[PDB]
RNA sequence: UAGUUGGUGGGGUAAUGGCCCACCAAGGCGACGACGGGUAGCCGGUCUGAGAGGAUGGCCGGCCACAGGGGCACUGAGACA
RNA sequence: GUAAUAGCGCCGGCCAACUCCGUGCCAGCAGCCGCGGUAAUACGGAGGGCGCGAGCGUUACCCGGAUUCACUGGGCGUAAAGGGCGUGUAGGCGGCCUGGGGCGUCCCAUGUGAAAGACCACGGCUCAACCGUGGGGGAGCGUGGGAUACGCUCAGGCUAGA
């Protein structure tokens, strides 16, 4: 472009588009849970994958991972939400936070606690 | 006399029928830490006559880098290819600052404080090449004198 | 608080030797003797060629657990002998080389760096008469670093001023073994020390 | 210093006012390239003096009505519709580029 | 037509110099003579002269190079690495004595035009002038 | 009302304050007219209260009314000993 | 687009002024973006960046605006408080 | 006057840190590429290791890397990108010579350009963070004076464009 095409028109400065509509652009979300389904992996993938569709205090009705060996979640169950998607669940952008509200944090967790919300066991 | 260091070495492959047939290429780095550079890129069956091919190759080839007190004597801005590497000159104590295929020739260039930018294609490859030609291009209130006695 | 745990593994990750306890790193026993492999299940595998991050990396670790120092501070040193005029690599190791605690050390009070942080910590020590107990205080030019004479009959700080009798100082140094007082005279050079580091690598590991 | 600055008259329909069409220069803040705005001041012309055409020296003064804040200090030089025309004809170029087009 | 004579001049020559030509013209112009004798002065060109073709006023300039190479082309270095227009209509640059680049870190100039003449950057330091910066040659 | 006076521009428990030409309405810590002196409470360091009585002068010359502490540093740096 | 743009006379103010009023003129603005919709308090600085630039303006200081929402004046040097 | 809180993240590549066991496209991991279907440095534990340390790690958001809106500093034959072509308005740009003007442009002086911050120096709190004092740099605009090469304007001339 010519400069005074540039001095014209001008350059048009980029617009980034979330990846995370917790609205608020909160760091996290709480929400009830409604479905405490079940699905399945995709192009290579297979297992049962845990998820949870959650009524957000945002206003929004979201799908949400739950990370960890084995949860306890129902049909009313408060939880948090943290965004992350996960690779393979088309559809679910947001992690459950293990150790929060209803979300009880993973039994006999000895690893990385820190996420799964486990307390630290106390050495016999 | 020469240390030599190995910017990078890829496994490349062909095809035949009946599948894949590799080959590498290693890229190195040859200098004397004094003012002498040379960079070659050797091919081979096998990592090590790769590795060896280049050395051979980097040590015929070799550049005379004008340091002045471990830094250059000014800025030169080289284009190779979609590579454009970026030299300009530091004070002591400054450091090498530059990435990594740069440094490494920078270094064993015997430079000691530089600023440096890999702008354009990041091709470590073709930012070498780009380099070397940027060393060569450098010349000195000497040689610039010289050239405009007549 | 700086580190503080088992110590000649360092000297052994670092493949060489670091004077983390002034004696005993000399008696057949600072573990480089004999063992100078890194520490671990994996230390006598063979070691695969570092890439330009990893020779960096072990690079500034050397320099930097040398002066038993926090990653922490140590950055705020290099940004500082980064703005500062004159070749980085050096001013460096100057302002690395005028901290207090680090001073004591040089002046034969205490045998290891780690001793002398205590004894400056502990009260112990000097600066121009008013005592300091801040090991990262930096000791500018001219100043006597004697010790504490409630603590100049300490077992410790005798010993040590003893075989101290004799031992050659820094030639940026001076001490006068008698009132245990000892002078900065000036900044340390790149060659004054004999440091197996290569600030070369310490600068471009902070350019990265 | 009340502000004094030169330009065209390019309108006389006003009562004791005339439009002023004063031009200026400067370098673009990030481009650098000298680009030229303009901007147009109702002055008082009380001796309905000043006519269409002419190049006066316009001076900072005590409000007069709204939107009309400067005085017609003097002429500088008289008759040169080469200019008008421009101003006129960019106008003209309006009475379209709508939902029609702007002629040519 | 003829946009820009300063910028046709100093094309020409990049281009002459290119093909190693030992002279080369461009139509005459005062402003066009008063670059030259930088040019010349500076060391870059061997130097110029008035002269007419087909009647018209023109300025021969005389191209210099280095010496003949050794290995596979032979081609001399030029002397005149680099010319490059900066100021150009359309996109006039001009600047203060304080914004007088220093042109391949003191190895290359500068033309610039001042009210006190055409100067290279140094000579216009030293004047403590600025003005349009016409070009840039090293 | 025009004032001389002090303004906090120390920090917790190390006060130190700076002899001003402001308005009497302005916050303490607010935008002053002038700086004429400053005023280290606990005298740190042997410089511990400059005055420029110069300046000082001036203000008084025309209607500067010092706060009480701040016109009994002023009379410290002799602002006005009249001798 | 009609107090809208200018004019003449006048009111009001500490004071200029369509600020307000009577009458007169026909106008004024726009693609150099009027009008409308949306968003927003604005700013020394701050973060980042080799720089140019990008992002930002909570704490602190400067200005503005508001005071449960809307409108209004009184008293005063000063408030529409 | 007693030897006297430690933790958190990570160890497939990017990226510094590897072994055994359990599991068997499961249970799970996942920022991207991807990992798990009986030898998994990629899942879970353990041992060992790397990083950082009243901390460590996650989530959210802004900037850098991104010359990925390119003024510095990009492009349009085939990768995204020449308008289907012309005529021409506004606008941007401008052959050769001389003279006037001095609008742009350049210079000098002067006024303004807060404080805080940024930079350098010295100083105060045991250091530092923080804070104090001093100094230097810094566009823009007002005013007076000056220069006239280039751009503009005016007048005149010529012809290399038309």
Redesign the interface.
């Given at each position: 472009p010519t400069?005074?095409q540039l001095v014209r028109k001008g350059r048009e400065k980029v617009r980034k588009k979330s990846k995370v509509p917790a609205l608020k652009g909160a760091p996290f979300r709480r929400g009830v849970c409604t479905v405490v389904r079940t699905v399945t992996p995709k192009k290579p993938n297979s297992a049962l994958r845990k998820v949870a569709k959650v009524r957000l205090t945002s206003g929004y009705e979201v799908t949400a991972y739950i990370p960890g060996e084995g949860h306890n979640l129902q049909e009313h169950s408060v939880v948090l939400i943290r965004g992350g998607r996960v690779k393979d669940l088309p559809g679910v952008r947001y992690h459950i936070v293990r150790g929060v509200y209803d979300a009880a944090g993973v039994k006999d967790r000895k690893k990385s606690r820190s996420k799964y919300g486990t307390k630290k066991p106390k050495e016999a | 006399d020469f240390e030599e260091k190995m910017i990078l070495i890829r496994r490349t492959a062909r095809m035949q029928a009946g599948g894949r047939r590799f080959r590498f290429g290693a890229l190195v780095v040859v200098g004397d830490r004094q003012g002498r550079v040379g960079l070659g890129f050797g091919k081979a069956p096998e990592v090590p006559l790769a590795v060896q091919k280049a050395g051979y190759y980097a040590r015929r080839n070799m550049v005379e880098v004008p340091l002045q007190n471990g830094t250059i004597?000014?800025?030169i801005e080289v284009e190779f290819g979609a590579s454009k590497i970026v030299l300009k000159?530091a004070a002591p104590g400054t450091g090498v600052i530059a990435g990594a295929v740069p440094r490494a020739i920078l270094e064993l260039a015997g430079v000691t404080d530089i600023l440096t930018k890999e702008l354009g294609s990041r091709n470590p490859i073709n930012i070498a090449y780009a380099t070397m030609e940027a060393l060569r291009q450098l010349?000195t209130?000497a040689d610039?004198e010289r050239?405009?006695?007549? | 608080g700086r580190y503080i745990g088992p110590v000649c593994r360092l000297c052994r990750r670092e493949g060489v030797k670091l004077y983390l306890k002034g004696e005993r790193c000399y008696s057949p026993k600072c573990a480089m003797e004999r063992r100078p492999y890194p520490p671990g299940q994996h230390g006598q595998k063979r070691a695969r060629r570092p890439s330009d991050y990893a020779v960096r990396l072990r690079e500034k670790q050397k320099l930097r657990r040398i002066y038993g120092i926090s990653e922490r501070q140590f950055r705020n040193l290099f940004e500082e002998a980064s703005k500062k005029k004159g070749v980085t690599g050096s001013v460096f190791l100057g302002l690395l080389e005028s901290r207090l605690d680090n001073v004591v050390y040089r002046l034969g009070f205490a045998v290891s760096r780690r001793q002398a942080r205590q004894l400056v910590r502990h009260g112990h020590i000097t600066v121009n008469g008013r005592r300091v107990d801040l090991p990262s205080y930096r000791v500018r030019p001219g100043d006597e670093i004697a010790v504490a004479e409630k603590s100049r009959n300490l077992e410790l700080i005798r010993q040590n001023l003893e075989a101290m009798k004799g031992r050659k100082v820094g030639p940026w140094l001076s001490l006068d073994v008698e009132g245990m007082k000892g002078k900065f005279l000036r900044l340390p050079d790149r060659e004054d020390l004999a440091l197996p580091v290569n600030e070369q690598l310490v600068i471009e590991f902070y350019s990265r | 210093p009340k502000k004094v600055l030169t330009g065209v008259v390019v309108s006389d329909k006003m009562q004791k006012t005339v439009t002023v069409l004063v031009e200026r220069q400067f370098?673009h803040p990030l481009?650098?390239?000298?680009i030229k705005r303009s901007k147009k001041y109702l002055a008082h012309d009380p001796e309905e003096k000043y006519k269409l055409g002419d190049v006066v020296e316009i001076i900072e003064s005590r409000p007069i009505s709204k939107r009309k804040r400067f005085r017609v200090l003097r002429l500088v030089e008289s008759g040169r519709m080469d200019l008008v025309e421009k101003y006129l004809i960019r106008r003209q170029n309006y009475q379209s580029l709508s939902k029609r087009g702007g002629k040519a | 037509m003829l946009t820009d004579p300063i910028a046709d001049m100093l094309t020409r020559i990049r281009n002459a110099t290119r093909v190693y030509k030992e002279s080369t013209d461009v139509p005459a112009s005062r402003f066009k003579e008063e670059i030259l004798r930088i040019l010349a002065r500076?060391?870059?060109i061997?130097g110029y002269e008035r002269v007419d073709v087909d009647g018209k006023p023109y300025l021969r300039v005389y191209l210099?190079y280095?010496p003949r190479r050794q290995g596979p082309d032979p081609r001399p270095?030029q002397?005149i690495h680099h010319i490059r227009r900066i100021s150009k209509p359309?996109?006039?640059?001009?600047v203060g004595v304080k914004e007088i680049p220093r042109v391949?870190?003191?190895?290359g100039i500068a033309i610039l035009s001042t009210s006190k003449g055409v100067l290279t950057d140094r000579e216009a330091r030293k004047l403590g002038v600025g003005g349009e910066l016409i070009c840039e040659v090293w | 009302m025009v004032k001389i006076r002090l303004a906090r521009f120390g920090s917790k428990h190390n006060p130190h304050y700076r002899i001003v030409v402001t308005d009497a309405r302005r916050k303490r810590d607010g935008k002053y007219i002038e700086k004429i002196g400053y005023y280290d409470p606990r005298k740190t360091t042997p410089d511990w209260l400059k005055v420029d009585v110069e300046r000082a002068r001036y203000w008084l010359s025309v209607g500067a009314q010092p706060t009480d502490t701040a016109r009994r540093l002023l009379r410290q740096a002799g602002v006005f000993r009249q001798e």
């Open positions: 400069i005074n | 004597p000014h800025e000159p010349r209130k610039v050239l405009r006695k007549g | - | 370098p481009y650098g390239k000298v | 500076e060391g870059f061997k210099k280095g270095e002397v359309g996109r006039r640059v001009y391949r870190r003191g190895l | -």
